[PDB]
Structure formats: C-alpha cells, structure tokens
Design a protein around this nucleic acid. Structure first.
Length: 49
DNA sequence: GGATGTATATATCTGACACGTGCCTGGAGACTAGGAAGTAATCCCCTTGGCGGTTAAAACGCGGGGGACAGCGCGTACGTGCGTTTAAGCGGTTGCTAGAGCTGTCTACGACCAATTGAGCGGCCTCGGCACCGGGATTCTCCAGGGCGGC
C-alpha cells in the first residue's frame, strides 16, 4: 500500500517529515510553501511506476 | 631664682526640649442619592493558521569615484598677565504708594430645576452633470467602360 497523509497545519507536516526522516521512509511533501514546478515534480515522482 | 607650658575648674553662649495657648481643620457619626458594578442581547472587529497569484520591493554582487580623514603649514585671534579705572556692593535718607491681610456689607451673577422646542443626525427624493444609445450629415475607397497598341 501507498498512503497520503493530510493535515491542516504545515508545522505538523514538518513534524511528520522529521518523523519519517529519522524513521527513514522515502516521503514526498506538498503544501503552500512548495512552488508549482516542484509540486509537478513531486506529483510525477509519486505517480511513476 | 624667674618665667613658660599644661591641666582642672567656672562662667557664659547657644541649639534643643517641653510647656502653654489658640484655632481651625480634620475626624466621628448619621443620612441619602447616584455612580458604578453586574447582567443579558446584538453586532462588528480582531486572532491564528492556512492557500493562491501579482508584482514591485528587497537583496546581492561589482565597478568606480566621491568624500572622509590624516597630515602639514600658517597666520591670526584668543589666552594670559599686569596696571588702571570703575562701578558693584553695602549702608543710609525720605517721603509716598502698592499690596497683603483682615473685617464688613451687599448685590448681581451663576447654579439649579421644570417645560419646551428647535438644531443636529439619519434616510428619501430630486437635480446637475456625466455617460450610453439611436439617427442625420460628410468624406474615402473601389469596380467597370472607353480608347489605344500589338500579332
């Protein structure tokens, strides 16, 4: 399985990103701080076979 | 042997403590009215954490020259000291007037209260001016016919 995780706060997204960084899980991220080019890059990277 | 240095005692000066007195202002006691605390309702602004898109401001780098700063010379203007003058400072005259303080009288002026009403705040209707739409007058580009030339 692959999982999306939705949050109302981007600071809680930072907390989960650090949790997966010390945990060691390949994660990708999207919020309002990420510009549209890196958003397109991340969505295409997650959807690649 | 005479006079000088020094110690203890006595009279006088002076700031401080307590006693006395007035008086007037603060405190005690009582009453009352209203200022403010509390309550409920309504509505609008502010808080925190986000997103999206524009864009002009902020940031960064680099070249260069204008300006800040240091040094040096110089000459003038200010400091310093002394002798002389002068006016400030103190004490003094001599009267009159201004002003603080106190007491007294009175009157016009402002506080206070009730009734009234007319000037301030909000909305509604209308006009002045600006703007949207329809119709008439004026000017520009174009398609076709007539005449001339060539094989």
């Amino acid at each position: 399985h692959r999982v999306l995780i939705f949050s109302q706060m981007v600071r809680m997204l930072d907390i989960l990103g650090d949790y997966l960084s010390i945990k060691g899980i390949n994660f990708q991220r999207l919020d309002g701080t990420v510009p549209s080019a890196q958003r397109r890059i991340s969505i295409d990277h997650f959807n690649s076979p």
